[PDB]
Design a protein around this ligand. Structure first.
Ligand SMILES: OC[C@H]1O[C@H](O[C@H]2[C@H](O)[C@@H](O)[C@@H](O)O[C@@H]2CO)[C@H](O)[C@@H](O)[C@@H]1O
Ligand SMILES: [Ca+2]
Ligand SMILES: [Ca+2]
Ligand SMILES: [Ca+2]
Ligand SMILES: [Ca+2]
Length: 450
């Protein structure tokens, strides 16, 4: 049966994906990095087959609720019960969900509880003074209550301690679920909101949809800090510790993969559900992984193939930011949120398709254990086993041809059939000699000798 461990997520910033209706292009200006660029819900529906053909099983949309001026990204909300006018209507969104569901795809909406836009009407309502915390900047970030009570980036910080605010938020959470039949929320700014709140929130949204999925963004690289939030009703967490290592290691050649395995081991140590961690090479808040490769003066296509190979073969829930599949460039926010281009070379689109198909086909890649057999200076072998399937993931992140011999770590008398690139390694006297040319990868299934 399908579980969230089995899912692959395609992550989209609505305004920056596909402008499928030019008639809602209000003040659009593609040459202003802080304007709306036109991407909308019709654009998303038009590309669902594109997304599915890459092997993606779910989509995550940045927030669709009406924003104030300047809020192209969706995080400066003006009305919690309205679809943003640039993106479409409520009916256009219900059709998106129906069309995703027709293709067996899940829909995750980005959901904000922490704050409103700078100019939300509530700020003028004398009866709403107590809906917001005192207007203060966050200074001591080691003070968790200051982090929870301060105005993040000057954004009006909602007071969940007020039961009217809490009820409003639960009410709206439940409404979108009941009205549009979405499958989950990606929860923004989870660490700026107190833990007791998430326990109650979780209980509310699953009371209306038993299997409703929550993915928490807890922006921190310490897994002990992040994992505490999984005890408060949030199913899955964004893996910033994975990201930190994967972005760095795969953006240049001749770098050790071992820190990624320690990320795993630490995930098993600290989290209740270590397969339910969202893994990624970049996102809408980081520099593009392509930019990291460019900065290192090295071919980004090659870097992405190795990184994506790891992403689609390691534990977790892969989350691929729109544009990864065309090596879309971009520096810091807002330059990491460039309009998508659908008319490029297809090399990475096809590669990603292969990887998504292999992750779907090979249950060891979704549910297997995860063992490190060998790692030296970027040359890595991993093993995964699920029931009677054994897979070996070989990533040569070195600038040399590498030969590694396994002798004991695999059952003798068999062969490793390469499913990514067609390699074949037969057991010779109980040994498997694995050869990979520089900056290549292969995913092998252990099978009878042919
Ligand atoms: O105006 C400040 C800031 O707000 C938004 O940032 C988001 C971020 O994208 C989320 O993933 C998360 O960390 O919460 C933030 C606040 O909701 C905009 O995305 C950003 O461009 C802007 O500077
Ligand atoms: Ca449009
Ligand atoms: Ca608006
Ligand atoms: Ca807060
Ligand atoms: Ca080693």
């Amino acid at each position: 049966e399908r579980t969230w461990q089995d899912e692959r997520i395609y992550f989209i910033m609505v305004d920056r994906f596909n402008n499928g209706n030019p008639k809602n292009d209000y003040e659009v200006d593609v040459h202003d990095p802080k304007a709306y660029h036109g991407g909308d819900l019709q654009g998303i529906i038009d590309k669902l087959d594109y997304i599915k053909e890459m092997g993606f099983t779910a989509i995550w949309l940045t927030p669709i609720f009406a924003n104030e001026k300047g809020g192209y990204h969706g995080y400066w909300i003006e009305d919690f019960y309205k679809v943003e006018e640039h993106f479409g209507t409520l009916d256009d969104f219900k059709r998106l969900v129906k069309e995703a569901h027709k293709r067996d795809m899940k829909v995750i909406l980005d959901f904000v509880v922490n704050h409103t836009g700078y100019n939300h009407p509530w700020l003028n309502d004398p009866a709403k003074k107590d809906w917001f915390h005192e207007k203060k900047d966050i200074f001591n970030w080691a003070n968790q209550q200051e982090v929870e009570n301060g105005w993040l980036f000057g954004l009006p910080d909602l007071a969940q301690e007020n039961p009217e605010v809490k009820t409003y938020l639960f009410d709206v959470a439940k409404w979108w679920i009941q009205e549009t039949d979405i499958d989950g929320y990606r929860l923004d700014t989870v660490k700026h909101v107190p833990k007791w709140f998430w326990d109650e929130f979780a209980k509310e949204v699953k009371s209306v949809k038993q299997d409703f999925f929550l993915l928490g963004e807890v922006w921190h690289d310490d897994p002990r800090y992040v994992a505490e939030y999984g005890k408060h009703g949030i199913d899955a967490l964004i893996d910033f510790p994975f990201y930190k290592e994967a972005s760095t290691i795969f953006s240049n050649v001749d770098q050790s993969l071992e820190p990624l395995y320690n990320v795993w081991k630490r995930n098993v140590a600290f989290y209740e559900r270590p397969y339910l961690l969202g893994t990624f090479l970049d996102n809408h808040d980081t520099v593009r992984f392509t930019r990291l490769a460019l900065q290192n003066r090295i071919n980004p296509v090659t870097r992405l193939k190795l990184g994506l190979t790891y992403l689609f073969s390691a534990p977790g829930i892969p989350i691929m930011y729109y544009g990864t599949e065309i090596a879309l460039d971009g520096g810091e926010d807002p330059d990491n949120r460039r309009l998508m281009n659908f008319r490029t070379d297809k090399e990475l689109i096809d590669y990603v398709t292969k990887l998504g198909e292999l992750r779907a086909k090979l249950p060891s890649l979704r549910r297997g254990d995860f063992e490190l057999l060998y790692e030296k200076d970027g040359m890595a072998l991993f093993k995964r086993t699920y029931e009677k399937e054994t897979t070996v993931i070989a990533i040569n992140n070195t600038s040399k041809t590498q030969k590694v011999t396994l002798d004991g770590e695999l059952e003798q008398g068999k062969e490793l059939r390469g499913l990514l690139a067609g390699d074949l390694v037969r057991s010779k006297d109980g040994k498997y000699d694995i050869i990979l040319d520089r900056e290549t990868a292969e995913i092998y299934v252990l099978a009878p000798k042919t």
